[PDB]
């Protein structure tokens, strides 16, 4: 299925692309961010 993309704001339907993960922040909004080492 289509995904959002790292460094981008998650969406209601949709999870982050394969490799990036959705993570909420203190500001209240959540954005995707590529995995880290």
């Amino acid at each position: 299925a289509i995904c959002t993309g790292a460094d981008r704001p998650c969406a209601a339907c949709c999870p982050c692309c394969p490799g990036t993960s959705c993570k909420a922040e203190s500001n209240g909004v959540s954005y995707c961010r590529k995995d880290e080492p």
Side-chain angles (χ1 to χ4, degrees):
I2 180 73
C3 53
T4 299
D7 270 314
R8 235 119 187 284
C10 298
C13 53
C14 294
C16 307
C17 296
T20 63
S21 346
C22 192
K23 52 206 88 282
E25 255 271 299
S26 230
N27 51 25
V29 187
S30 308
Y31 302 82
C32 300
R33 233 75 135 284
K34 58 261 216 156
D35 281 324
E36 287 266 271

mmCIF file of all heavy atoms in Angstrom:
data_model
loop_
_atom_site.group_PDB
_atom_site.id
_atom_site.type_symbol
_atom_site.label_atom_id
_atom_site.label_comp_id
_atom_site.label_asym_id
_atom_site.label_seq_id
_atom_site.Cartn_x
_atom_site.Cartn_y
_atom_site.Cartn_z
ATOM 1 N N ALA A 1 0.860 -1.217 0.000
ATOM 2 C CA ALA A 1 0.000 0.000 0.000
ATOM 3 C C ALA A 1 0.883 1.250 0.000
ATOM 4 O O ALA A 1 2.043 1.199 0.360
ATOM 5 C CB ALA A 1 -0.883 0.001 1.249
ATOM 6 N N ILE A 2 0.338 2.369 -0.404
ATOM 7 C CA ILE A 2 1.135 3.629 -0.433
ATOM 8 C C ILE A 2 1.493 4.039 0.999
ATOM 9 O O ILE A 2 0.746 3.795 1.929
ATOM 10 C CB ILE A 2 0.311 4.734 -1.112
ATOM 11 C CG1 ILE A 2 1.113 6.042 -1.151
ATOM 12 C CG2 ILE A 2 -0.993 4.961 -0.341
ATOM 13 C CD1 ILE A 2 2.235 5.927 -2.184
ATOM 14 N N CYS A 3 2.630 4.660 1.177
ATOM 15 C CA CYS A 3 3.051 5.091 2.535
ATOM 16 C C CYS A 3 3.292 6.601 2.544
ATOM 17 O O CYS A 3 3.213 7.258 1.522
ATOM 18 C CB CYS A 3 4.341 4.368 2.923
ATOM 19 S SG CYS A 3 5.602 4.593 1.639
ATOM 20 N N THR A 4 3.587 7.152 3.693
ATOM 21 C CA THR A 4 3.838 8.619 3.787
ATOM 22 C C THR A 4 5.279 8.914 3.352
ATOM 23 O O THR A 4 5.515 9.435 2.278
ATOM 24 C CB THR A 4 3.611 9.076 5.236
ATOM 25 O OG1 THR A 4 2.263 8.817 5.599
ATOM 26 C CG2 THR A 4 3.891 10.579 5.375
ATOM 27 N N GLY A 5 6.243 8.583 4.177
ATOM 28 C CA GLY A 5 7.667 8.839 3.814
ATOM 29 C C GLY A 5 8.405 9.452 5.000
ATOM 30 O O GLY A 5 7.869 10.264 5.730
ATOM 31 N N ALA A 6 9.639 9.065 5.195
ATOM 32 C CA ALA A 6 10.445 9.614 6.331
ATOM 33 C C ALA A 6 10.422 11.144 6.313
ATOM 34 O O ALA A 6 10.070 11.763 5.327
ATOM 35 C CB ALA A 6 11.895 9.130 6.221
ATOM 36 N N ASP A 7 10.816 11.749 7.399
ATOM 37 C CA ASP A 7 10.853 13.239 7.485
ATOM 38 C C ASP A 7 9.517 13.856 7.041
ATOM 39 O O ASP A 7 9.464 14.995 6.618
ATOM 40 C CB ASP A 7 11.975 13.759 6.587
ATOM 41 C CG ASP A 7 13.272 13.854 7.392
ATOM 42 O OD1 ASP A 7 13.224 14.365 8.499
ATOM 43 O OD2 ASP A 7 14.293 13.416 6.888
ATOM 44 N N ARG A 8 8.441 13.116 7.140
ATOM 45 C CA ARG A 8 7.110 13.659 6.731
ATOM 46 C C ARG A 8 6.098 13.385 7.856
ATOM 47 O O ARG A 8 6.325 12.518 8.672
ATOM 48 C CB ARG A 8 6.657 12.974 5.430
ATOM 49 C CG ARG A 8 6.330 14.027 4.356
ATOM 50 C CD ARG A 8 7.250 13.841 3.146
ATOM 51 N NE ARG A 8 7.043 14.969 2.185
ATOM 52 C CZ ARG A 8 5.984 15.018 1.402
ATOM 53 N NH1 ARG A 8 5.064 14.081 1.428
ATOM 54 N NH2 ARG A 8 5.847 16.022 0.579
ATOM 55 N N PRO A 9 5.012 14.130 7.884
ATOM 56 C CA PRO A 9 3.945 13.981 8.930
ATOM 57 C C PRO A 9 3.077 12.750 8.659
ATOM 58 O O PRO A 9 2.512 12.598 7.593
ATOM 59 C CB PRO A 9 3.134 15.263 8.803
ATOM 60 C CG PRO A 9 3.345 15.786 7.396
ATOM 61 C CD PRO A 9 4.672 15.216 6.893
ATOM 62 N N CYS A 10 2.965 11.867 9.626
ATOM 63 C CA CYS A 10 2.133 10.634 9.450
ATOM 64 C C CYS A 10 0.717 11.017 8.999
ATOM 65 O O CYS A 10 0.353 12.179 8.997
ATOM 66 C CB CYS A 10 2.052 9.881 10.782
ATOM 67 S SG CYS A 10 3.709 9.352 11.287
ATOM 68 N N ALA A 11 -0.078 10.050 8.617
ATOM 69 C CA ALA A 11 -1.468 10.354 8.162
ATOM 70 C C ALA A 11 -2.459 9.444 8.889
ATOM 71 O O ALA A 11 -2.101 8.396 9.393
ATOM 72 C CB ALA A 11 -1.572 10.119 6.654
ATOM 73 N N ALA A 12 -3.708 9.839 8.945
ATOM 74 C CA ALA A 12 -4.748 9.010 9.635
ATOM 75 C C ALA A 12 -4.711 7.565 9.119
ATOM 76 O O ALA A 12 -4.388 6.645 9.846
ATOM 77 C CB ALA A 12 -6.131 9.607 9.366
ATOM 78 N N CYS A 13 -5.044 7.364 7.866
ATOM 79 C CA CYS A 13 -5.036 5.982 7.281
ATOM 80 C C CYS A 13 -3.697 5.285 7.565
ATOM 81 O O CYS A 13 -3.658 4.179 8.066
ATOM 82 C CB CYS A 13 -5.262 6.063 5.766
ATOM 83 S SG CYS A 13 -4.061 7.196 5.017
ATOM 84 N N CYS A 14 -2.606 5.964 7.341
ATOM 85 C CA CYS A 14 -1.492 5.331 6.581
ATOM 86 C C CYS A 14 -0.221 5.336 7.442
ATOM 87 O O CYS A 14 0.077 6.332 8.071
ATOM 88 C CB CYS A 14 -1.238 6.126 5.300
ATOM 89 S SG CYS A 14 -2.670 5.978 4.200
ATOM 90 N N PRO A 15 0.508 4.233 7.456
ATOM 91 C CA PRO A 15 1.768 4.106 8.245
ATOM 92 C C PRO A 15 2.944 4.660 7.443
ATOM 93 O O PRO A 15 2.819 4.951 6.268
ATOM 94 C CB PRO A 15 1.912 2.606 8.452
ATOM 95 C CG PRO A 15 1.152 1.924 7.329
ATOM 96 C CD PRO A 15 0.209 2.958 6.706
ATOM 97 N N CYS A 16 4.083 4.805 8.066
ATOM 98 C CA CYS A 16 5.270 5.339 7.340
ATOM 99 C C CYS A 16 5.790 4.271 6.372
ATOM 100 O O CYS A 16 5.497 3.099 6.510
ATOM 101 C CB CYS A 16 6.372 5.712 8.336
ATOM 102 S SG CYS A 16 5.709 6.828 9.603
ATOM 103 N N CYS A 17 6.563 4.672 5.398
ATOM 104 C CA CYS A 17 7.125 3.708 4.405
ATOM 105 C C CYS A 17 7.920 2.613 5.136
ATOM 106 O O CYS A 17 8.214 2.768 6.302
ATOM 107 C CB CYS A 17 8.037 4.498 3.464
ATOM 108 S SG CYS A 17 7.042 5.696 2.533
ATOM 109 N N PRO A 18 8.257 1.538 4.445
ATOM 110 C CA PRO A 18 9.049 0.407 5.039
ATOM 111 C C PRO A 18 10.487 0.866 5.291
ATOM 112 O O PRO A 18 11.254 1.091 4.375
ATOM 113 C CB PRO A 18 8.976 -0.688 3.983
ATOM 114 C CG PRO A 18 8.683 -0.005 2.666
ATOM 115 C CD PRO A 18 7.913 1.272 2.998
ATOM 116 N N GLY A 19 10.837 1.034 6.538
ATOM 117 C CA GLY A 19 12.204 1.515 6.896
ATOM 118 C C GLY A 19 12.043 2.704 7.842
ATOM 119 O O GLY A 19 12.786 2.874 8.789
ATOM 120 N N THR A 20 11.047 3.508 7.590
ATOM 121 C CA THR A 20 10.768 4.688 8.453
ATOM 122 C C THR A 20 9.652 4.309 9.428
ATOM 123 O O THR A 20 8.867 3.418 9.159
ATOM 124 C CB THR A 20 10.306 5.854 7.574
ATOM 125 O OG1 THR A 20 9.090 5.503 6.920
ATOM 126 C CG2 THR A 20 11.378 6.153 6.526
ATOM 127 N N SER A 21 9.581 4.962 10.561
ATOM 128 C CA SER A 21 8.514 4.608 11.554
ATOM 129 C C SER A 21 7.804 5.871 12.055
ATOM 130 O O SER A 21 8.395 6.926 12.159
ATOM 131 C CB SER A 21 9.136 3.868 12.746
ATOM 132 O OG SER A 21 10.457 3.450 12.418
ATOM 133 N N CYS A 22 6.537 5.759 12.378
ATOM 134 C CA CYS A 22 5.782 6.939 12.884
ATOM 135 C C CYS A 22 6.076 7.122 14.369
ATOM 136 O O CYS A 22 6.033 6.188 15.147
ATOM 137 C CB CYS A 22 4.281 6.726 12.688
ATOM 138 S SG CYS A 22 3.404 8.285 12.977
ATOM 139 N N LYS A 23 6.374 8.324 14.754
ATOM 140 C CA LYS A 23 6.680 8.613 16.186
ATOM 141 C C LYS A 23 6.077 9.964 16.575
ATOM 142 O O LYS A 23 6.359 10.976 15.962
ATOM 143 C CB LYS A 23 8.199 8.642 16.395
ATOM 144 C CG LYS A 23 8.854 9.580 15.376
ATOM 145 C CD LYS A 23 10.306 9.149 15.147
ATOM 146 C CE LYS A 23 10.363 8.108 14.026
ATOM 147 N NZ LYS A 23 9.947 6.778 14.554
ATOM 148 N N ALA A 24 5.250 9.985 17.589
ATOM 149 C CA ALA A 24 4.624 11.269 18.023
ATOM 150 C C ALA A 24 5.663 12.123 18.754
ATOM 151 O O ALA A 24 6.694 11.633 19.174
ATOM 152 C CB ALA A 24 3.453 10.975 18.963
ATOM 153 N N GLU A 25 5.394 13.396 18.907
ATOM 154 C CA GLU A 25 6.348 14.287 19.605
ATOM 155 C C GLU A 25 5.617 15.033 20.723
ATOM 156 O O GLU A 25 4.431 14.856 20.934
ATOM 157 C CB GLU A 25 6.932 15.290 18.602
ATOM 158 C CG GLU A 25 8.372 14.902 18.258
ATOM 159 C CD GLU A 25 9.330 15.564 19.249
ATOM 160 O OE1 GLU A 25 9.354 16.783 19.298
ATOM 161 O OE2 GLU A 25 10.026 14.840 19.944
ATOM 162 N N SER A 26 6.323 15.867 21.435
ATOM 163 C CA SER A 26 5.695 16.638 22.546
ATOM 164 C C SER A 26 4.766 17.705 21.964
ATOM 165 O O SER A 26 3.757 18.049 22.550
ATOM 166 C CB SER A 26 6.792 17.304 23.382
ATOM 167 O OG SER A 26 6.575 17.015 24.757
ATOM 168 N N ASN A 27 5.101 18.229 20.812
ATOM 169 C CA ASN A 27 4.245 19.278 20.178
ATOM 170 C C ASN A 27 2.820 18.755 19.958
ATOM 171 O O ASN A 27 1.891 19.524 19.793
ATOM 172 C CB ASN A 27 4.853 19.692 18.835
ATOM 173 C CG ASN A 27 5.132 18.449 17.985
ATOM 174 O OD1 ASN A 27 4.502 17.425 18.157
ATOM 175 N ND2 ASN A 27 6.059 18.497 17.067
ATOM 176 N N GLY A 28 2.641 17.461 19.957
ATOM 177 C CA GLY A 28 1.277 16.888 19.749
ATOM 178 C C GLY A 28 1.157 16.299 18.339
ATOM 179 O O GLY A 28 0.282 15.496 18.073
ATOM 180 N N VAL A 29 2.024 16.688 17.434
ATOM 181 C CA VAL A 29 1.953 16.148 16.045
ATOM 182 C C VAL A 29 2.975 15.030 15.881
ATOM 183 O O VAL A 29 4.024 15.038 16.499
ATOM 184 C CB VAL A 29 2.247 17.264 15.041
ATOM 185 C CG1 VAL A 29 2.005 16.750 13.620
ATOM 186 C CG2 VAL A 29 1.322 18.453 15.315
ATOM 187 N N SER A 30 2.668 14.062 15.059
ATOM 188 C CA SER A 30 3.606 12.929 14.854
ATOM 189 C C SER A 30 4.167 12.966 13.430
ATOM 190 O O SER A 30 3.475 13.313 12.493
ATOM 191 C CB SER A 30 2.860 11.612 15.066
ATOM 192 O OG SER A 30 2.198 11.642 16.324
ATOM 193 N N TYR A 31 5.415 12.605 13.266
ATOM 194 C CA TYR A 31 6.034 12.603 11.913
ATOM 195 C C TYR A 31 6.850 11.325 11.742
ATOM 196 O O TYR A 31 7.287 10.728 12.707
ATOM 197 C CB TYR A 31 6.973 13.799 11.776
ATOM 198 C CG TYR A 31 6.214 15.081 12.023
ATOM 199 C CD1 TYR A 31 5.990 15.520 13.333
ATOM 200 C CD2 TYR A 31 5.739 15.833 10.941
ATOM 201 C CE1 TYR A 31 5.292 16.711 13.562
ATOM 202 C CE2 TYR A 31 5.040 17.024 11.171
ATOM 203 C CZ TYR A 31 4.816 17.463 12.481
ATOM 204 O OH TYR A 31 4.127 18.637 12.708
ATOM 205 N N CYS A 32 7.081 10.918 10.523
ATOM 206 C CA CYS A 32 7.893 9.693 10.286
ATOM 207 C C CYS A 32 9.363 10.081 10.344
ATOM 208 O O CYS A 32 9.720 11.216 10.103
ATOM 209 C CB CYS A 32 7.589 9.104 8.908
ATOM 210 S SG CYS A 32 5.836 8.673 8.784
ATOM 211 N N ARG A 33 10.210 9.145 10.654
ATOM 212 C CA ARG A 33 11.662 9.425 10.717
ATOM 213 C C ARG A 33 12.387 8.127 10.386
ATOM 214 O O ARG A 33 12.111 7.092 10.967
ATOM 215 C CB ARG A 33 12.038 9.906 12.123
ATOM 216 C CG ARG A 33 12.796 11.228 12.023
ATOM 217 C CD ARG A 33 11.816 12.360 11.695
ATOM 218 N NE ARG A 33 12.113 13.543 12.561
ATOM 219 C CZ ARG A 33 11.770 13.567 13.834
ATOM 220 N NH1 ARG A 33 11.152 12.555 14.399
ATOM 221 N NH2 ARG A 33 12.052 14.622 14.549
ATOM 222 N N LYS A 34 13.292 8.159 9.448
ATOM 223 C CA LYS A 34 14.017 6.912 9.060
ATOM 224 C C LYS A 34 14.681 6.280 10.288
ATOM 225 O O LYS A 34 15.084 6.961 11.211
ATOM 226 C CB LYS A 34 15.081 7.237 8.006
ATOM 227 C CG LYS A 34 16.059 8.284 8.555
ATOM 228 C CD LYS A 34 15.681 9.672 8.027
ATOM 229 C CE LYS A 34 16.951 10.486 7.768
ATOM 230 N NZ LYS A 34 16.665 11.544 6.759
ATOM 231 N N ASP A 35 14.784 4.977 10.300
ATOM 232 C CA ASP A 35 15.408 4.270 11.460
ATOM 233 C C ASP A 35 16.833 4.785 11.685
ATOM 234 O O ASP A 35 17.441 5.359 10.802
ATOM 235 C CB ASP A 35 15.450 2.768 11.176
ATOM 236 C CG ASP A 35 14.070 2.159 11.433
ATOM 237 O OD1 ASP A 35 13.412 2.603 12.359
ATOM 238 O OD2 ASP A 35 13.695 1.258 10.700
ATOM 239 N N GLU A 36 17.364 4.581 12.863
ATOM 240 C CA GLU A 36 18.747 5.054 13.161
ATOM 241 C C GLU A 36 19.639 3.848 13.496
ATOM 242 O O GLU A 36 19.136 2.774 13.759
ATOM 243 C CB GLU A 36 18.710 6.010 14.356
ATOM 244 C CG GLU A 36 18.106 7.348 13.922
ATOM 245 C CD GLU A 36 19.226 8.314 13.531
ATOM 246 O OE1 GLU A 36 19.711 9.012 14.406
ATOM 247 O OE2 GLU A 36 19.581 8.338 12.364
ATOM 248 N N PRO A 37 20.943 4.051 13.481
ATOM 249 C CA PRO A 37 21.948 2.984 13.784
ATOM 250 C C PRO A 37 22.203 2.902 15.292
ATOM 251 O O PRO A 37 21.318 3.274 16.044
ATOM 252 C CB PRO A 37 23.193 3.458 13.046
ATOM 253 C CG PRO A 37 23.078 4.966 12.887
ATOM 254 C CD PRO A 37 21.624 5.358 13.164
#
